[PDB]
Amino acid sequence: KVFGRCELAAAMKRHGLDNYRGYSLGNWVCAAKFESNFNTQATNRNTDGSTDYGILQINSRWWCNDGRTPGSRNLCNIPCSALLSSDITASVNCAKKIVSDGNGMNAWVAWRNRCKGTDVQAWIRGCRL
């Protein structure tokens, strides 16, 4: 599913991401924009052999099992394929574990490089939330 900007902001807010560990909703929408262009089906291969899955490009190196990432963890206890669903529950629940792991949203290189220190509030501007 390709979400609309405000549609994803509303779904993320409903699943409890607005100011989760102090990260305002605009941070999460901004991250999804530059990770996936709001596409739940986005996948991309990493140099190390791992793969990024879904709206927030969660990595098989630590967070999910894709059956093909040797010497990796499955800390979200999910098949990576669950991160590709039109229902963002597994992506949100896994992102809450990732952002709590000590590095906050810096775990998303795209967040650090494209969202951090920017006017992220712009990403929820005009949305009925």
UniProtKB/Swiss-Prot annotation:
GO MF term set: beta-N-acetylglucosaminidase activity; identical protein binding; lysozyme activity
Record's keyword terms, sorted: Allergen, Antimicrobial, Bacteriolytic enzyme, Disulfide bond, Glycosidase, Hydrolase, Secreted, Signal
Catalytic residues of the enzyme: E35, D52
Example GO biological process: defense response to Gram-negative bacterium
Keyword Transport: no
InterPro entries: Glyco_hydro_22, Glyco_hydro_22_CS, Glyco_hydro_22_lys, Lysozyme-like_dom_sf
Keyword Hydrolase applies: yes
CDD domains per UniProt: LYZ_C
Domain of life: Eukaryota
Expressing tissues: In the egg white and polymorphonuclear leukocytes.
Pfam family, one: Lys
Residue sites binding substrate per the record: D101
EC assignment: 3.2.1.17
GO cellular component: cytoplasm; endoplasmic reticulum; extracellular space
Places the protein is found: Secreted
Top EC class for this record: hydrolase
Function in brief: Lysozymes have primarily a bacteriolytic function; those in tissues and body fluids are associated with the monocyte-macrophage system and enhance the activity of immunoagents. Has bacteriolytic activity against M.luteus.
Family: Belongs to the glycosyl hydrolase 22 family.
Subunit note: Monomer.
Record's protein name: Lysozyme C
Gene encoding the protein: LYZ
